[PDB]
Design a protein around this ligand. Structure first.
Ligand SMILES: [Cl-]
Lengths: 145, 138
């Protein structure tokens, strides 16, 4: 509910993303990220990373999602996009959903290092685990490497 | 010494390094000192080993993690999930630390403790005894 520091489970766990209802959309960022400095800027920062990564036209309609390990992210719904990261020189082709996961990972890791806020670090580890279980894990890990 | 900055993306190769005798005394405050009730972590690890069971060595990890493990195969039992598993004293220590860290994160709502859980957990994932470790903490 609040992306608490307490783990729902330890050990091995099947991770699942669930769309945030339209009713609860507006409360998403403070509810899950409100302990982190500059949380109101995270959504703009994700779109910023997506613009850096996108080779030509990406676009889409973006939704908000929660994870059953306490994580949370934004992406288009689960057509392919080509991304390119200049920091590592890699190109990768992937679904709009996977691209969104990739943009959020980059956002969370960068912002954790800037703020030294462990709550941001935990969001990174939680989404990273979802990426590690994802059918397009190889492409996601390639682009963020 | 412990940073909220996590640079690893894919599955990085992790190494555990024993803490030199000289640096033993400063281990707990250096790695856990910004966490409420950090002085309780050592006795709580000893307690989880008592519960699960069997000198301790202190270790640091190259992802910023840290743990301790005692120095044969032991049989552990966790009443929380009803699982039993055979493993080395090192593996048992890793298991005891993972339970201590996860529980203290819930107790304190301190995210640095959650990060310690993840960092040690990733070492367990690449450990030869991953299956036994993950089973006992399921
Ligand atoms: Cl499996």
């Amino acid at each position: 509910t609040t992306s608490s520091a307490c783990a729902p489970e330890t050990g091995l766990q099947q991770l699942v993303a669930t769309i945030v209802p339209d009713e609860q959309r507006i409360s998403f960022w403070p509810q899950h990220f409100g302990l982190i400095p500059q949380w109101v800027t995270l959504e703009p920062r994700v779109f910023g990373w997506m613009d850096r990564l996108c080779e030509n036209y990406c676009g889409g309609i973006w939704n908000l999602y929660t994870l059953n390990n306490g994580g949370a992210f934004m992406a288009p719904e689960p057509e392919t996009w080509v991304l390119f990261n200049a920091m590592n020189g890699n190109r990768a082709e992937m679904s709009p959903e996977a691209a969104g996961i990739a943009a959020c990972l980059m956002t969370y890791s960068h912002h954790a290092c800037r703020t030294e806020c462990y709550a941001m670090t935990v969001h990174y580890y939680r989404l990273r685990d979802y990426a590690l279980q994802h059918p397009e894990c190889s492409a996601i890990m390639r682009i963020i490497d």
